[PDB]
Amino acid sequence: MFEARLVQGSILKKVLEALKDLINEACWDISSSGVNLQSMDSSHVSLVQLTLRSEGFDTYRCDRNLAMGVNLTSMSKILKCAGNEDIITLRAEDNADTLALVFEAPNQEKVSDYEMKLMDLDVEQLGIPEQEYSCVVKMPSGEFARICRDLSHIGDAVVISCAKDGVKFSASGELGNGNIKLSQTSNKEEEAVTIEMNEPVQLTFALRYLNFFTKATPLSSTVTLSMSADVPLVVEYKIADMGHLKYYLAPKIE
Amino acid sequence: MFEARLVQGSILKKVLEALKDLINEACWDISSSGVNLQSMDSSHVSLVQLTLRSEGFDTYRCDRNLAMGVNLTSMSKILKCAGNEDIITLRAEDNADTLALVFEAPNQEKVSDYEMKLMDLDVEQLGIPEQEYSCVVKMPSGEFARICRDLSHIGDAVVISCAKDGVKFSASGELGNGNIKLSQTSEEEAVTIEMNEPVQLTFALRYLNFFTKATPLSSTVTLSMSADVPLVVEYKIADMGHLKYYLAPKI
Amino acid sequence: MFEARLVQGSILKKVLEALKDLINEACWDISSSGVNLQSMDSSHVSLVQLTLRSEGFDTYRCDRNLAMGVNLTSMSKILKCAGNEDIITLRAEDNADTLALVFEAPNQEKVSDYEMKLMDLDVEQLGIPEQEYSCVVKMPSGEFARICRDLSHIGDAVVISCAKDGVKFSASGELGNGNIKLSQTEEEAVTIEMNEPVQLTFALRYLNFFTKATPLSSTVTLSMSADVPLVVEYKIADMGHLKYYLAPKI
């Protein structure tokens, strides 16, 4: 039997809003350490890696490890039926082919109860080579969202250039070029930009895919980009006090 | 000569939004007792019944019993031209084939008047019986809207089961099935159940989500159910009249 | 080398929102007096004239006059990359075929730096003959915008009746007709400089393009006369104006 209770229901709503369009179907690896998802996008280019640690749940109890195949688009629609301040509880038996989802209200006079059919999936977990990185920019998620959206109307590709003073995002297409430049900051609040830099890095990335990652933006005030040459970029969102949601993306070659 | 003058113009705007895409043509029944409207939707599944009593207007006056037919799309387009705290005066003079709408702003600087054309309609007054029902459930309207909206993700129909403890809503479809449950309370956000016998009926959410366009008119809604008879979703237009929606259960 | 620095960048974002759908391509006249743009619309019905005097730029330099052709849609997309509180700075070289724009966040350590392509353009500069007007109305920009938006549902053309008491807007179509009548006189204040009474007809389709300029000003002026086009002026305060000229029906 599996039964994880989560008081911040919104966390789960937000995660599935991020992923549903990027990935159609995925295998939710449950264990006593918690919930994990790892999958490539429909078009096999970006890797996604969710970690919800069991510590982070109010109540958690998994006995056997599960490998629940889920249509995320389906799971998303059901999470719409939860309010943002609802307490959510997931639950499952081994020889049932159904994840159950229970939404308790904050007024506490309403209780929703859904049952989501699962599916059988053909999933490998790839090796994410756990690394140290040349550059690691930590900045506001809203700002990075802005930068990625704005440059989409200039070009298809962004060149991230990382140095000690700051980071630069650049793009080129049919109507000109553009050049966004952020510097390190602060003594002011958590709208702060910071860099832990070992070597300079310059890498080109697909803006189409980065704009898919930024659907995660409402999880976290801040976002960490980690880079090194000839290895994937890691856009990371802390699901604070619980885990993270990481998008991996390889740069372009020439 | 007809002339009603409503201070809460908003009430008139809200009613037209609740109707205009459920119904494209209907006959307004004007009288000394107030304004009534009875109609069925474009495709004959649901029956709407409006009531706005003469007492509920500021000024009220009706010489004869007019029956003006109105393209509701065109009328809603005119009520777009009125602000929310505007004062709406309806007026029809003798044998002109047109309804006038006058808008006066709360500041009173701006004054706007509109001449809408009428159309000839085929009036069969299906005056369905004033029944008394097995279960009568009284609950927040916005809560009722959320429930109908959500369960559409799940399926095409909603099963409304009723009891003394609480009302229950259920739906099934391709992706799985769902089951929302409202328990009874001990004043404005209160949930209450006048239950003679237990009920369990099944309705098309498509139509329920047309009814809930009427949710601006009231903080609460009263659902009325009985076996093999039509459901009544009633938004009160408080101290003024009501707006009832009728819908039959499924095969 | 030209270089104009505007602290209220938003002005420029708003100007291009008010123009991009009405005119696709346009020629910007850069001189020591400021920035001017005069051009006819897509379908050759209405004239637009923009002025931004050099005084209103917090820094301004122009060593030689310029005629930059600009695809206003392209430019509208580049300006979308600027925050409402950014300091925008236009800049052009001796004789390059690019305009450089520079967006600086007022405080927060962010400079965006764009470079837009230009294009060759033979446009006919039409001299605007300065006229005396019979009526000139001053009303709230947002109320004129509300009116042309509302009457759009009733008919395709609006009749503007200007008396000393107030000003009347009317429209007729299939579904019916409507009148909106405004008195004379606070912030929302209608006020009329009346010489001779006027009543003229105008395409609402074009008015509702002009009113996209509404974010530039709390007030808007209408200036009418018979056998001569309507002037819808939006003041870009302490700087210049955006004027739309439109000829009437019949």
UniProtKB/Swiss-Prot annotation, chain C:
Concerning PTM, the database record says:
Phosphorylated. Phosphorylation at Tyr-206 by EGFR stabilizes chromatin-associated PCNA.
Q: One Pfam family this chain carries?
A: PCNA_N
Record cross-link Glycyl lysine isopeptide (Lys-Gly) (interchain with G-Cter in ubiquitin), residues: K164
State how changing Y206F affects the protein, per the record. Answer: Alters chromatin-associated PCNA stability and its function in DNA replication and repair
Q: Which cysteines are joined by disulfide bonds?
A: C135-C162
* Impact after mutating K164R: Abolishes ubiquitination. No effect on interaction with SHPRH
Q: Which residues bind DNA?
A: 61-80
Keywords linked to the UniProt accession: Acetylation, Deafness, Disease variant, Disulfide bond, DNA damage, DNA repair, DNA replication, DNA-binding, Dwarfism, Host-virus interaction, Isopeptide bond, Methylation, Neurodegeneration, Nucleus, Phosphoprotein, Ubl conjugation
The reply to whether Transferase figures as a keyword in the UniProt entry is no
Instruction: Give the UniProt subcellular location, in the record's own words.
Output: Nucleus
> What cellular component GO annotations does this protein have?
centrosome; chromatin; chromosome, telomeric region; cyclin-dependent protein kinase holoenzyme complex; extracellular exosome; male germ cell nucleus; nuclear body; nuclear lamina
Task: Please give the Gene Ontology molecular function terms for this protein.
Answer: chromatin binding; damaged DNA binding; dinucleotide insertion or deletion binding; DNA polymerase binding; DNA polymerase processivity factor activity; enzyme binding; histone acetyltransferase binding; identical protein binding
What else is on record for this protein?
Answer: Antibodies against PCNA are present in sera from patients with systemic lupus erythematosus.
The record's family statement is: Belongs to the PCNA family.
Illness association? Ataxia-telangiectasia-like disorder 2: A neurodegenerative disorder due to defects in DNA excision repair. ATLD2 is characterized by developmental delay, ataxia, sensorineural hearing loss, short stature, cutaneous and ocular telangiectasia, and photosensitivity.
User: What is the name of the protein in this document?
Assistant: Proliferating cell nuclear antigen
Task: Provide the species name.
Answer: Homo sapiens (Human)
